[PDB]
Chain length 291, copies 3
Amino acid sequence: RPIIAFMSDLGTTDDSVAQCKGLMYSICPDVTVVDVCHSMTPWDVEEGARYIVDLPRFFPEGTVFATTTYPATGTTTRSVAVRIKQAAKGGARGQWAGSGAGFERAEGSYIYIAPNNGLLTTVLEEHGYLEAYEVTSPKVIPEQPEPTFYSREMVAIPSAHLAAGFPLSEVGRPLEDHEIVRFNRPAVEQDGEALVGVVSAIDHPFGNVWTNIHRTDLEKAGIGYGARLRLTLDGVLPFEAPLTPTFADAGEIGNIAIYLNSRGYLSIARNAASLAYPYHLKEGMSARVEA
Amino acid sequence: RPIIAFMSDLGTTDDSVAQCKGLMYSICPDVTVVDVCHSMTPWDVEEGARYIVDLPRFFPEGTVFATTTYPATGTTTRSVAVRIKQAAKGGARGQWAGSGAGFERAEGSYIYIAPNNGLLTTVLEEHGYLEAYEVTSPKVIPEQPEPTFYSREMVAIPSAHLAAGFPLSEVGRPLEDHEIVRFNRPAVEQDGEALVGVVSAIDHPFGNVWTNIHRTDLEKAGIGYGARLRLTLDGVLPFEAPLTPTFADAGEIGNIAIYLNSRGYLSIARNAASLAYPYHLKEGMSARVEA
Amino acid sequence: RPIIAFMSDLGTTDDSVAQCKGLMYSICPDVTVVDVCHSMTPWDVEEGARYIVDLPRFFPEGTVFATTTYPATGTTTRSVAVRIKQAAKGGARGQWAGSGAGFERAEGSYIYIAPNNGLLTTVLEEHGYLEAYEVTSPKVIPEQPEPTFYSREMVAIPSAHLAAGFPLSEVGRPLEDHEIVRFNRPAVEQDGEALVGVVSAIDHPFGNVWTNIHRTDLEKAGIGYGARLRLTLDGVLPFEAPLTPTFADAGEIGNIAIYLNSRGYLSIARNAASLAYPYHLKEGMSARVEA
Ligand SMILES: C#Cc1nc(N)c2ncn([C@@H]3O[C@H](CF)[C@@H](O)[C@H]3O)c2n1
Ligand SMILES: C#Cc1nc(N)c2ncn([C@@H]3O[C@H](CF)[C@@H](O)[C@H]3O)c2n1
Ligand SMILES: C#Cc1nc(N)c2ncn([C@@H]3O[C@H](CF)[C@@H](O)[C@H]3O)c2n1
């Protein structure tokens, strides 16, 4: 019944992840370990951030998220363990997840544990937190941590203790908000009637394009479903389409759909074809939208 | 103890699959989720069909197969949930799976749930079915399904309710056989003493080549183990070898083996080397066999 | 609760692994199956060896390691099942794994089951073994094993019986040490006061380079942390750096770190950048080190 959702940059090609898992079952034999993904670009905390920010509403209360890319492994840094506040609504409309009207989740029901290197920046933004600790107790980490494997020693091990009900406040000292490292999230700029941001992700394996322009950004510029839009990527690739709910509304196979993705962000795709791959579109390219 | 075997086109590079899983453990905390694979070519229902058709005999009775590529996500379509009839025999001979003489499986012991887009075509062919329903009840799907994620909303969510014993007949109305979408399976043609079909799959990661020419097709043309065969791929590449049980019977490393694969289909490989990759062989190429 | 750690060359792109798993839950419904990895280069027993040799100390006592690349599938060969002796200390220093001072593991607490094709060579070297059997009983393998799938029939099936407490000595006859196939581990040679070995692995996804030159080989040539080293790969690519504990000690991003990896072997990397990929370094290349 206790659950650890595990996200790393360790890859799926050797025994790394399994060593972490072995230890997790050693510390908490009834735990269920769920892989989020292990394929993130190493050291890109922004990319890791995206894969973990939306998890809580999908998981049972009490779930621990162990989340790590650890470029500072072997240094004096220590992980941070955080009890978030609201599981938050999400998606294209703003709802709970699940059958019926969804499963609503109590506040303070989820713990993230991560290197204190910015990885939880967006988790804290969207969810807030109740308490936050530096993870230092030798009860939950090794007295002699492997210098090149803090992902295992400083995240995976202690997440299993946490999953086994080890008290969050005993992992180490409390952290003041400014001691929690953040990365800068680039804002979405207004520019005439236009909104300007970036391609935040390519949606693998489909090659859909996700922007950082949220539905809230769109509504506060007079834009809802059915609005005819111009969406320019990379300064040069304009596209035009009405904003629709889904891919199939584009009509013919191959046609352009502009839609709100399952996180509520402005997105673009081809109907039953890949948009991004044939045109080598990339995370980071500009993205401008207007009616 | 209940099991969901999960097959999607969602990939292994983001949080998509994990969101489904979180929900599965939310709806049925004692469930075991087994990944079939998440790597299929998006929207290729024929390829998905292959990965799910042979599962039932390997799994404990009561197992639910949640299987999805969902190109029609966000439209008015609804999934179908089916209780299959026979778990069937399979493999190069026709047997149950497991130690000893195998574990034989009761009829009606398995449920598939899938978009109604053809994905279960071969499942129904090989296994038959007892009952089939459109999945519509808000008890097992969301009242507001995420338009771009029906794989989660219309397959994963309800599969967990089913796995938790939710009655199959209450998911929605019964479906007449003709309401269950099918794809055309191309038949194997006789042509003089020859049989003509197609390369159905490349067997990754080994680069073995699988055809659609079944052992039954071979026995009804006088062909058994030890028969010297000519197998022509792509109209032009005409291999010759005796039909053998396995790869190592080819003699030297690199040599050609023609054999019956673990599903009973005519196949070709190199002994301890990849056949398909150096020669860019592909699913879809012709395949002709004769003695 | 019983655990099977599963390592194969079957890949993650079809139903192969799932068929094994289905059977594992069929034979032992309370088992937890942990994927080590399924991505190894087919038939490369040396590569598989690396992924399994360090597992035991991470896992709870009683864990069964089912480990397989099975190029001799369909032949008269039979798997070997081995109860290892010491779980052994490991890592850059030599320690148990886990929080505090680690979880020490009783002798004889782990079983490996594998083709008898050399795959356990290094497991036996580093761990020793108490008992070893040929796996032949039809109680734990099929009477008609699928010729092309001994990985399932001769490893996965019997590993589940073993996991369920089936007595190890009843799987088949005992094996004399010389009946257990080994591969030659190339030794590390001294040359002047240089040490000469090979690149044993590229550490995906990071592109770090691992050699077969152990810390013990280094201490017995007067080399400890802080020693300024020359490390020449491929006969031609020299590098120089002090031997440090971790990556971040290299100073600037992109700079060269020479370190001891989490298994205790001499390694080289770039700080927060990939070393191996831009320069197409490969498993097998020479590796020479000196002060
Ligand atoms: C600066 C740098 C740095 N450089 C590397 N070459 C490197 N390779 C692996 N790591 C980190 O080691 C962690 C394992 F704990 C992984 O999560 C990685 O982030 C690395 N960090
Ligand atoms: C027409 C089209 C269509 N077009 C796309 N660009 C696309 N991208 C993802 N999907 C489907 O969205 C489903 C998520 F449930 C996945 O199973 C995919 O098959 C898509 N469907
Ligand atoms: C010689 C040769 C040989 N040749 C092949 N073309 C081949 N394809 C798959 N296998 C083995 O089939 C096993 C499944 F049991 C896998 O683990 C592989 O090692 C193979 N072995």
